[PDB]
Amino acid sequence: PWAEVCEKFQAALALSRVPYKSKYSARALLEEVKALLGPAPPVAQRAVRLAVIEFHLGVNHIDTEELSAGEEHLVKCLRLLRRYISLCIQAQNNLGILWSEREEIETAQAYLESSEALYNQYMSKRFEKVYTHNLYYLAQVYQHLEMFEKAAHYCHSTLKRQLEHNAYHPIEWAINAATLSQFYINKLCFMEARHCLSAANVIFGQELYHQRKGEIARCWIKYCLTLMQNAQLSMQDNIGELDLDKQSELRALRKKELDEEESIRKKAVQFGTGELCDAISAVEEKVSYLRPLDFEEARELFLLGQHYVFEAKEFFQIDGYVTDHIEVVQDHSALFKVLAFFETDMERRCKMHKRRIAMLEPLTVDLNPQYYLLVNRQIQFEIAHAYYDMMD
């Protein structure tokens, strides 16, 4: 009655999928399976089958992970597994999270490392999934280990596999780019970061339905902010009209070739297999921006395009964060004019100043004693009048 046994297994299996809804009877099924271990009695493969059963019995022994006996059983299973398919590393990973509970990171680390090594040592749905799950688990570990860059590497590879397959959702993509941006900003790899949000711009082809756009625009602002901060490598208050004393190399073939060498890695992000790489290629027009000089006009236009989005986000904010983001844009706008170190232009100052006044009034809505919130706004006026002083 081998099949009948397998049917009982099947049933139990289905029941494992199924006022307690679990344990009560599931534990009986655990034992029912053990009862079937009886009947189970080449033999080597029998043992393999049995080991798998024991894996599931170990899984049955969880109960909020209180059943450490199950842990022991899994260890016993591991031994049996080590004697000589991929479930074994899945199980290993399950042991890894128990070490996490036991704070034994190092062993869990080793487990995960070997899980990957074994795949690589080797060389229609499960693998695709768990492969990336493992990377996720590693990232968590890395957080504790502070392996910053490795976690980042994995992030990209999970997005990679996501791209390989059809596991998509536009918002998630957008926010992913949002985080990646900042990462590379902190790492100063601006030139790579360039493709990230712009990659999301490709994604844009398909509540947050409309609101999501502003978050994106915020990030676009941040790009530009950092780019100006890059300009701040050479500070105006220690120089006169002279600058760019440094080398040119703004079109260096040196940089081109070295980037070609580096971009062997970088370009992996272009998982558009030509088609979307072409979409990206259209987008590359803006990705091309690197170390510009007299393009302040263009710089402001970059804002403008996303300023329109900003305006929409104002529609999407409840007269609170509206003013918070206006602050951002105002300063940002002023900074573009800061870049434009020319005498005949204080109009932006005036333009944003008008906004400052309008933004002051809202204290009527917020009469909480938000002293420093107001002080910040007052500081913005300090700055405004400091800029007046700057002018005169």
Numbering used by the authors: 5 to 22, 32 to 54, 86 to 128, 135 to 173, 200 to 282, 301 to 486
Relevant lines from the article:
Kinesin-binding protein (KIFBP), which is mutated in Goldberg-Shprintzen syndrome, binds to and inhibits the catalytic motor heads of 8 of 45 kinesin superfamily members, but the mechanism remains poorly defined. KIFBP interacts directly with the motor head of Kinesin-2 (KIF3A), Kinesin-3 (KIF1A, KIF1B, KIF1C, KIF13B, and KIF14), Kinesin-8 (KIF18A), and Kinesin-12 (KIF15) family members, resulting in inhibition of motor-microtubule binding both in vitro and in cells. We show that KIFBP is a tandem repeat protein constructed of nine helix pairs that assemble into a solenoid-like structure. Collectively, our work describes the molecular mechanism of KIFBP-mediated inhibition of KIF15 and KIF18A via binding to and stabilizing a conformation of the kinesin motor head that is incompatible with microtubule binding.
After determining the structure of KIFBP alone, we used cryo-EM to determine the structure of KIFBP bound to KIF15. Unexpectedly, when we docked the structure of KIF15 into the reconstruction, we noticed that the α4 helix of KIF15 was missing. Instead, we noticed the presence of an additional α-helical density within a cleft of KIFBP, suggesting the displacement of KIF15-α4 into this cleft during complex formation. In the structure, KIFBP occupies the microtubule-binding surface of KIF15, sterically blocking access to the microtubules by KIF15. The most notable structural change involved the repositioning of KIF15-α4 away from the kinesin motor domain, placing KIF15-α4 15 Å away from the location found in the crystal structure of KIF15 (37). The adjoining loops on each side of KIF15-α4, Loop-11 (“KIF15-L11”) and Loop-12 (“KIF15-L12”), accommodated the repositioning of KIF15-α4 by facilitating the extension of KIF15-α4 away from the body of the motor domain. Whereas KIF15-L12 remains extended in solution, KIF15-L11 is positioned away from the motor domain and binds along KIFBP-HP4a. In addition to seeing changes in KIF15-L11, KIF15-α4, and KIF15-L12, we saw that the overall structure of KIF15 adopted a more open conformation. The structure showed the shift of α helices KIF15-α1, KIF15-α3, and KIF15-α6 away from the core of the motor. Thus, KIFBP blocks microtubule binding by sterically preventing microtubule interaction in addition to allosterically altering the KIF15 motor.
